[PDB]
């Protein structure tokens, strides 16, 4: 009752295995990583940069096909070849696109033919359809093969541009997302022609970077298509980023109104999903929260009480993959 | 014909020297530092972490009290009382306030008494006015006892906000800086009873921190006086910082319109205090980079044509210390 | 009955302080930080860069004066001299010297004028003797006033030092410690008299530093006195540091001779000290790991068997904080 | 006559470019490489996070093909097969393996099926020699058609090694080289069965790293064949690194001895490749700079008269793509 099956043991994949591991309601059948052998995968997975060594059971017994957690085997497959894995063999149910290549539905749809039921891309993706835990989630039918669990910043943005646009009313919104480095920026300045400031040195280079979480909102809450967009900056921290949110209302507010509602929501319907915080935080300080968005109060400001500009944290190597179970958990039901 | 002091050999202080000893306008006559020793003063100087090793003259000859920069003596004084310092003395009419402590024009105003003539702020300040060089440091007047500079951040957004307000009518803004980091962070996480999340380590967080420039526009752009404010995010970073500015506009204007004012307005009045690129740029581009202000036209990104984002980079160290100098010598002719 | 306080919240300071809350055979009963207040030592304490936000139970009580750990007594002083502490009119029978200046013996029995029992220094001390747990602890007496822990890298050297000299002799030895960068270090090149290097820019330099600890590792096992000195870098790692040491050996040691003399040590009398390791670890992976010292087996490297080159981790901040506790502790048993 | 090509424009592909294109004595004729386009081309080379913008002309003419430093031709390949690069059929005589994979003679003659006349590896060869500048460069013969230039970490060690060795005599040595990351490592926790710590993110991490140099100097050196071993640990530095020699001598010296020694060889014989600094130095002390090795006088310390610790800094990057050229222009010289 809800296998999981793991397609890229990136830092996602990895995250994502984490919580499945540490969860009752689901359990990790298998995972598929040719760039990675099934002894440096039990490394890649007991030690990490971000989030601690790992404190509960594993080990490793097949040559090359399976591990043991504790008393739980994983098969393991090496196959570049989205098709010839064998789901289902493994009984793999529910499938992570985590390798963040094949996130076109078209492209995510090659897991089925290995026998897989349902397939989860971790990311955003152009034709598979969109799902935000917490605000859409439950927009999801039985029916649907293919399924993108959005991206962090859309995760981050989503919730909180809900609660301000229900209570307030959102005309315009511009965003930035002060974000930290991931796996496809590089150490030093290096190739990159898909975006060329993305090559130059991540960890000693403010770096303008091209996002769509806040156009992948409208598709995510339909109510505000095409009323937000915005853009990124890399910069060098290795985990946890945070949305800069300057929005035009409709119905004045001042920010203690603002605050109290978000307060609200995070007591009410978004508990666990959407956070509140009043303390002098800082990105360390969200390390390992599953918390998809958490409001900064003391942080945000106000200039009228139809403009606002709203701080939210989260961490988007955590969280993410917190959402990503939770998806598959209200599909498993629903 | 020009004399300079500097009460504060911090990182503007040195910065300020470097610039003045390039300089044929300026003579660089004395400095006042308790906390550093002539000789360290003189290795303080050559070797930095940012701008590179100094690739002209110097020397140190005498004891305690002055130093030889080729064949240019200047003198030296550990005085922390700010009277106690023998301005006019050592010739220096002009002071360069680097300590970031004496900020008050009330408090700024102890040279005099050592009998220097005029006093310069590398910084805000409440009460002595403010001139950002382009914008309204012709406003300066003769008999001016204290004045100010303002700070890296307003001599980058004031600019920039100058264009577009005359071109096409500031209605709202809001603006974030993602900056780099200073003096007053810490290495560790330690005591900061001013800004709490200051004293966080600064070199691996994302920090929230208090700005002021946004208002501080409207004290040198009094047009703006009301109309901004903002915030900033200190990052992993040594040195360059980038100005986020949300704006809502009286009169529409397509991206390229603005872009192409701005362009304009770089070629006329702000060659050289206002610049612009269209190129794949990052922060390290622009260390020794003599602007206030950069436009990044591919960075940028507008949601309607009456709301739009822009960015623009300055090297909080360079730049300011450049126009501080600039500032004195429009002082020095008016 | 084991009542502790603390005379500088530092790093030192908060760490001991959550090693000392979480332990059951010792209580924590007041605090002394003249430049931070209560509640903000609330901030501090809870909040954490490196060892992340705290999982137990604690807050703040009584109008300053004290604090509260779950209904318990922590008396909060924030005075600046170092006696007039009521140590004794309040409890606090064993103090924490982790302020980092009155490092002098001299200077730490301040404390006993305030009415304390017995002071450890966390640091080493010229005058005062000093003792590194799981070497020379026991050659402590019940009646001596006042005494050293030593310090991060000498509590990470002196167990591998025992060990080697031991089983095989150790003729001379020349030591580096690849070490991160400490509270003492400047974010921006800055004044440093004490250490000219010390105050470029911490977290883009690598810093020739000196230690002391090698040749202070006599001073706790006479047998070496005089037979090693050595060296630091400081580089911009937030915490965790190695020691690298150079040896030429008395009997000649093949490599895994020298392995399993080390894992046998680690597993006998030296659990908890000294431990060991055949992984391919990183400098984060030992965040947060109590042991003075872990050998990094794969790493090292021999020339001959009598010259080789061995690595030991150590987390500065967390085992030495262990370290001074277990220290009390040992002492408190008269 | 010097006309050359370089196959891979990564960091040392580009870094020899500034310094061929900058030195007269040389021209610099086409360039391979297929992840690059010429205009990507042109933005690489013009921007760098390290060693800043370019201060001379460049731009780009032909749809492709060709570029232009300053009216002049420089020939554009992306031809990933190390043959079919018309190196003759172009003017490509002598050739810079700068991609890092062909370091194999075998390999690396592949360039000569393309036409060139002469191969230089920018890194060590299993198979083809090596030729450490200032050292053994004379050793080369006129008819050696491939060729190595060593490593980064192997041109600063070697110079000291001589100058050590010819004066007092080197028993045994160790070395330590703390060393800046390279395009090698990883952002983040990544994949990497190479080198498994390799694979930790770069940035946020110490990471022991194996080197050969040091061996391999007796390769370059043969008098002190296999008297020397050692280790890396990279650090989160953009580039300059330092290499630590732990050495027993036959004779006696004092420090000064070795000091004397060595700012002697540095002023005679080894001026421009072996530097010497008593200066309280750190490491962006040395961003471009083009000696081989720089003696730290003040770092290094010695235990006996015939053991001692000696610390060289050198840049990783521009040292030795310095050396690169000069060594062909060497080869030049029949
Ligand atoms: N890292 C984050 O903070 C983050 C957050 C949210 C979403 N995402 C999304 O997750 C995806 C990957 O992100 P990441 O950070 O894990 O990158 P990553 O490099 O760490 O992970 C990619 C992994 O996939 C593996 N892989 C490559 N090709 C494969 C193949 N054909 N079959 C199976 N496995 C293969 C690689 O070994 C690699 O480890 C991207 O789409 C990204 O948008 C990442
Ligand atoms: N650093 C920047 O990027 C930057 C940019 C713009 C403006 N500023 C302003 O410059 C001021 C200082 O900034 P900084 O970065 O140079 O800080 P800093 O710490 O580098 O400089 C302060 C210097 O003043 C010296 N000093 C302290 N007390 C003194 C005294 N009483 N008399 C004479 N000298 C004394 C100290 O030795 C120190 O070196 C602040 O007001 C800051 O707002 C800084
Ligand atoms: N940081 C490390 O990795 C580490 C490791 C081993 C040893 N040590 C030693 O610990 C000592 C402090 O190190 P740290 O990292 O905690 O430095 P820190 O600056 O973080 O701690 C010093 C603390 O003492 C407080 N303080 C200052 N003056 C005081 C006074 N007169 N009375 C009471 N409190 C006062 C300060 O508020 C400060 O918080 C140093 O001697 C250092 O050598 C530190
Ligand atoms: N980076 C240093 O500090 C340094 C110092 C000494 C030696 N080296 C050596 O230099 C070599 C490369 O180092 P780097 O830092 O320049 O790495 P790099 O990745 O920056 O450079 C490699 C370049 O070669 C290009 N390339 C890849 N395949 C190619 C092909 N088949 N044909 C033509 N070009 C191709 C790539 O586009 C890349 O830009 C390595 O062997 C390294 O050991 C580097």
New interface residues.
């Given amino acids: 009752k809800i296998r999981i099956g793991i397609n890229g043991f990136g830092?996602i994949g990895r995250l994502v295995a984490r919580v499945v591991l540490q969860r009752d309601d689901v359990e990790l059948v298998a995972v598929n990583?040719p760039?990675?052998?099934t002894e440096?995968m039990t490394?890649?997975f007991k030690?990490?940069?971000?989030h601690?060594?790992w404190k509960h059971n594993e080990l490793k017994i097949k040559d090359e096909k399976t591990l043991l957690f504790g008393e739980k085997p994983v098969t393991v497959f090496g196959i570049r070849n989205p098709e010839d894995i064998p789901w289902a063999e493994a009984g793999a149910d529910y499938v992570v696109e985590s390798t963040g290549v094949f996130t076109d539905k078209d492209k995510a749809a090659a897991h089925l033919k290995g026998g897989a039921k349902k397939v989860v891309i971790s990311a955003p993706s152009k034709d598979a359809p969109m799902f935000v835990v917490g605000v859409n989630e439950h927009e999801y039918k039985s029916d649907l093969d293919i399924v993108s669990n959005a991206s962090c910043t859309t995760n981050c943005l989503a919730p909180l541009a809900k609660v301000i646009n229900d209570r307030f009313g959102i005309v315009?919104?511009?965003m930035?997302t002060?974000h930290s480095?991931?796996?496809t920026?590089?150490?030093?300045?290096?190739?990159s022609?898909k975006?060329?400031?993305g090559?130059?040195?991540?960890?000693?280079?403010?770096?303008?970077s091209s996002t769509g979480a806040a156009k992948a909102v409208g598709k995510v809450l339909p109510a505000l298509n095409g009323?937000?967009?915005?853009?990124s900056?890399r910069?060098?921290?290795?985990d946890?980023?945070?949305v800069?949110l300057?929005v035009?209302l409709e119905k004045a507010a001042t920010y203690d109104e603002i605050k109290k509602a978000i307060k609200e929501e995070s007591e009410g319907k978004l508990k666990g999903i959407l956070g509140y915080t009043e303390?002098?935080?800082?990105?360390?300080?969200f390390?390992?929260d599953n918390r998809s968005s958490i409001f900064?109060a003391?942080?945000?400001?106000a200039?009228?009480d139809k403009?606002?500009?709203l701080?939210s944290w989260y961490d988007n190597e955590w969280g993410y993959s917190s959402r990503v179970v939770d998806l598959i958990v209200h599909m498993s039901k629903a």
Same sequence: chains 1, 2, 3, 4.
């Fill in positions: 830092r990583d760039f990675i052998t440096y490394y890649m030690y990490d940069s971000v601690g060594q315009e919104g511009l930035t002060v480095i991931t796996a920026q590089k150490t030093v300045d290096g190739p022609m975006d060329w400031r090559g130059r040195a991540a960890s000693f280079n403010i770096i303008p009323k937000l967009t915005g853009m900056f910069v060098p921290t290795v946890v980023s945070v800069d300057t035009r303390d002098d935080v800082v990105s360390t300080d390390v390992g900064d003391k942080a945000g400001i200039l009228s403009f606002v500009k701080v």
